[PDB]
Every structure is written in C-alpha cells, then in structure tokens.
Write a protein that binds this ligand. Structure first.
Ligand SMILES: *[C@@H]1O[C@H](CO)[C@@H](O[C@@H]2O[C@H](CO)[C@@H](O[C@@H]3O[C@H](CO)[C@@H](O)[C@H](O)[C@@H]3O)[C@H](O)[C@H]2NC(C)=O)[C@H](O[C@@H]2O[C@@H](C)[C@@H](O)[C@@H](O)[C@@H]2O)[C@H]1NC(C)=O
Ligand SMILES: CCCCCCCC/N=C1/SC[C@@H]2[C@@H](O)[C@H](O)[C@@H](O)[C@H](O)N12
Ligand SMILES: [K+]
Length: 496
C-alpha cells in the first residue's frame, strides 16, 4: 500500500517525511507499451510521486531534446547503499521494534528504495562510541585472541541479517578497516600519523593481512559473506600528522607492495578467494596517480578488482581528469564510490533537517559519477541522531535518516529520496548508455538500460527555472515532459 509522506518543516528549504512505530511513507505494488512512468520529487514537497504519460511517434520544435544512444554501451552497475556503522546500528536499535522494521524496510525492501550494498567497518571508526580492534591483546602475531565484540555480534550482524531478509535483491557486503591493532603500528596509537611497522612482506604485514581473513572467518561463522573489501579506509589520513581518529597511513607505493606481497596472496589462499579487493578508498584527486603506482605492478594488479573513491575533495578534482583519465588508462578496473556524507565541514551545521540542497548534492554526485564510469555509490552512516552522531571525536555529519529516540520517530530527508531515485530504479547489472543533448542546458541527466532491456533516465534540475524537454528513444518514440526547477525525476519505459 502507498502511504503519502507526512511532511514536517524545520525551517530549511524543504520538508522531511515523518515516520514512527505505526506509519511510514511507502509505494504501491509495481508500465504498459507506448507509455512511460515518471517519478518526481520537488523542493516544494513531492516525494517520488508517480505519474504516466504517452510515448509519441513524432516530435517537432526546437526545445531541449535528449537522445538515447542505446548502442553506446558503458559500465554495468553494481548498485547503491549505505554503511552500518556502530552509530547507525545504535540509532536504529534506539527505536521500538516496529519503527526499526519500517526504517529497515525504507532502505532494503522493494517497497522502499531497494538498497543492495552495505558497507561494514572492520572494528571501530570515528562513528563508534569506543575505541577497539578485534585483536587488542599486544604482540598476538598469531591472532589467537582475535574476537568480534558485541558491537558486531549483538548490533551490526543481527541488523544486517534483518536487512537481508527484507531484500528481494541480493545484497552485497563491503568491508573496510580504519585502524589495525596499535601494536602493529609505528606510533602505537589508533589515530595520528603512523603506519604499519616494518615493510610489506614482513611479520607485521603478514599479521595485518591475516586479520582480514580472520574477520571474514568470524563473519562467515555468523552466516554473512562479503562481496568486497577495501585495502584501507582513506590511507592518506594516516600520513597526516595529528589525524584525530582511527587511521593507518599508506603511501601509494606502500599500498602496492602490501597488496602484492601480503594482502593479495593471503586472500587468494583462503576459503575467501572470491571476495573482491578494492584499492584506494580515498579522494578522487589521488587518481590517476595511485592507479598508476599500484596497477602498473603486475604483481599487485593481479589482485585488485577495483578502485574505491570518497567524494569529499571533489571540488579540487574535475571528474574527467581523475575518473575519466583513470578509466581511459585502466578500463578493466572498476571505479566505485564507497563513501559520502554532507555536513562534515567545520563551518557547516552537521544536520540540516529538510535541506533540499543536500539532496541535490547526492544526485548531482551520483549522476556525475555514472557519467564517468563509476559502477556503484554508497552513502555513509544509514541513520544518525539529530546532532549527527554519536561519534567519539564529535566528527558529526548528516544522514538520509535522522532518528529521534525520545519521540520513537525518524525523519527521511531529501537525501533519502534523491538516492531512491537511483537505487529503486537501477538494479544490479543495469548498463549505462549514451545520452546527448541538443543544446547547452543546466540539467544533469543520465540514461541506463535495465537487464530486461527496458530504459531508465534520471533528470536532475539544479536551477530555479522550469525546462520543458523531450527525450528521444530511437524506434520507440518521444516523451514530452518538463523538468521543474529544483526537481529530480526518474523516467522508466519498456522498449519491448
Ligand atoms: C505516527 O504517525 C501517524 C501518521 O502521521 C499518526 O497518525 C495520525 O494522527 C494525526 C494527528 O494526531 C491524525 O489527524 C487528524 O484528523 C482530524 C480530521 O479527521 C484533523 O482535524 C486533525 O487536525 C488531524 O489532521 C491523522 O489522521 C493520523 N494519520 C494517519 C494517516 O493515521 C500517529 O498518531 C497516533 O495515532 C492516531 C490515529 C491518533 O490517535 C493520534 O493522536 C496519535 O498521535 C503516529 N503515532 C504516534 C505515536 O504519534
Ligand atoms: C585534511 C583534509 C580534510 C578534508 C576531509 C577529509 C575526508 C574525510 N571527511 C569525512 S566526513 C565523515 C567521514 C568520516 O566519518 C569517515 O570516517 C572518513 O572516512 C572520512 O574522512 N570522512
Ligand atoms: K560540521
């Protein structure tokens, strides 16, 4: 059953949708040839609302025309999701159980927005309320005392199981570490400037690499398998003197030799050889330099399935020079966006309930990434409190869902819908295809083909001006529509 959004304003540019123990917005059950479906969200308050129109055989005029080039084939989509941090888990479980179910449904269900990716930190990050690794007992090179604590066994793992039961789509898990045990590090601390002791290939590096296998073991004992792991979350962090929360620094040469000598072989000789390894997990300005240092060494290249990027310094990194150039040089190594949130700059408010601007940053990043070959996009924390935490160093940020414990209430923000416009309608295996514009325009738009050959187009209007437009699909026809200011649309049609 479709239930509209209950809107509530907090004085920002748009509303949130209010959900509680007994009510949350949702969709009806799921067109017909020669018609299209349109989903629309607007700053004014529409939330993924469904309409239909006809596909017309002819068209005339000089308005903006967008033309699919379905024979121009690019990358296949892996998918979309968010991260189950310690904070996300504590926030979700702070709700009554029926409200928890509706929050999980909103993300993971086909009646929600159909996430198919969850990122899971290996032990503690800044979005944790205590500092721990899985092997804190000093000098345990054999990892006999490797253990998952309750943050995993009572919080994260049972929530991930419930997300899997809700999903119809297969859901892929991605793991990333922030720090190693402090006794493997040069500075003997979870934060600050410091890297693994010694050099790739030695006892410290072989132990760190075994720690990934032990992690995959412990999770598999709890019946969870991984699609992929990253070699390190933001390895450049640990090069930065005073870095305030968990990290572990690698130069690109250091990452190359660690993956070639320790991490690659250790994974390939385990029962977990099918888990993919992703490198970088860092700002895209490190591209294409890091891809060059690592992937021109055939011993590291043979283990690296892809490159993960974070969005935070995007303003210093035009997409063509980083993503584009990387795909040109290394087209067989997939690009994947592994982490993004807004609110993290020192001078921004962490949480702005109902910010349409923040919603637009999500979809503009997602469309730009798809336009430059990226196969998937993962948000950061799945839910936060109204402060943007908790977070042991107060590195508060915003989230698509904000949980208010004392009201047994949660708020879906514009970000939630800007993401849904893609995750709901672009299943795994969808393939990005060509789309060209007849004149300069202010729209961001991308076109993909579903596995069954039907079409999906996302149109984001970041300007205040209504742009009437047409979408041309060769040998099915023409969709006449309009892209209102501050809107996002998703169009779907069978080519059948
Ligand atoms: C969880 O959230 C849901 C949906 O928002 C709450 O349900 C609803 O409560 C509204 C206000 O309390 C209801 O509204 C009114 O009706 C009359 C006219 O018929 C108006 O004059 C009036 O000003 C309101 O608009 C609304 O009908 C109802 N919405 C739906 C679709 O169910 C729910 O609230 C709780 O249960 C309901 C049935 C009432 O008894 C409420 O008092 C009560 O808060 C929310 N649950 C909680 C704990 O807040
Ligand atoms: C010194 C350069 C500072 C620019 C911002 C650094 C990039 C990270 N910003 C944020 S904002 C919030 C997230 C962190 O919570 C996450 O742990 C990190 O992976 C990531 O650092 N992050
Ligand atoms: K902030």
């Amino acid at each position: 059953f479709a239930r509209p959004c209950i809107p509530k304003s907090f004085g920002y540019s748009s509303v949130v949708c209010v959900c509680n123990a007994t009510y949350c917005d949702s969709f009806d059950p799921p067109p017909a040839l020669g018609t299209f479906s349109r989903y629309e969200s607007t700053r004014s308050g529409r939330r993924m609302e469904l309409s239909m129109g006809p596909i017309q055989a002819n068209h005339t005029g000089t308005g903006l025309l967008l033309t699919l080039q379905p024979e121009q084939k690019f990358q296949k989509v892996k998918g979309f999701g968010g991260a189950m941090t310690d904070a996300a888990a504590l926030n979700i479980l702070a709700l009554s159980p029926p409200a928890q179910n509706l929050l999980l449904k909103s993300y993971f269900s086909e009646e929600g927005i159909g996430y198919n990716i969850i990122r899971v930190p290996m032990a503690s990050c800044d979005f944790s309320i205590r500092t721990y690794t899985y092997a804190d007992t000093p000098d345990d090179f054999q990892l006999h005392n490797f253990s998952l604590p309750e943050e995993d066994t009572k919080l994260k793992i049972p929530l991930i199981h419930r997300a899997l039961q809700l999903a119809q789509r297969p859901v892929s898990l991605l793991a990333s570490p922030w720090t190693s045990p402090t006794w493997l590090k040069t500075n003997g601390a979870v934060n600050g400037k410091g890297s693994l002791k010694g050099q790739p290939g030695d006892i410290y590096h072989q132990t760190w690499a075994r720690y990934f296998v032990k992690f995959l073991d412990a999770y598999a004992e709890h019946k969870l398998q991984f699609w992929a792991v990253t070699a390190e979350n933001e390895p450049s962090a640990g090069l930065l003197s005073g870095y305030p929360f968990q990290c572990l620094g690698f130069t690109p040469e250091h990452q190359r030799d660690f993956i070639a000598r320790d991490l690659g072989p250790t994974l390939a000789n385990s029962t977990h050889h099918n888990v993919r390894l992703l490198m970088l997990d860092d700002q895209r300005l490190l591209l294409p330099h890091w891809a060059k240092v690592v992937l021109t060494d055939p011993e590291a290249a043979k283990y690296v399935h892809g490159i993960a990027v974070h969005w935070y310094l995007d303003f210093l990194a035009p997409a063509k020079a980083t993503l584009g150039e990387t795909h040109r040089l290394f087209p067989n190594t997939m690009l994947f966006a592994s982490e993004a949130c807004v609110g993290s700059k020192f001078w921004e408010q962490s949480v702005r309930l109902g910010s349409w601007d923040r919603g637009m940053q999500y979809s503009h990043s997602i469309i730009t990434n798809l336009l430059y070959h990226v196969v998937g996009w993962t948000d950061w924390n799945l839910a936060l409190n109204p402060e943007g935490g908790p977070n042991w160093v107060r590195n508060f940020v915003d989230s698509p869902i904000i949980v208010d414990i004392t009201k047994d209430t949660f708020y879906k923000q514009p970000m939630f819908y800007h993401l849904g416009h893609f995750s709901k309608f672009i299943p795994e295996g969808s393939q990005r295809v060509g789309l060209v514009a007849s004149q300069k325009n202010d729209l961001d738009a991308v076109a993909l083909m579903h596995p069954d050959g039907s079409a999906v187009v996302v149109v984001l209007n970041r300007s205040s001006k209504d742009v009437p437009l047409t979408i041309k699909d060769p040998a099915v026809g023409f969709l006449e529509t309009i892209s209102p200011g501050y809107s996002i649309h998703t169009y779907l049609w069978h080519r059948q």
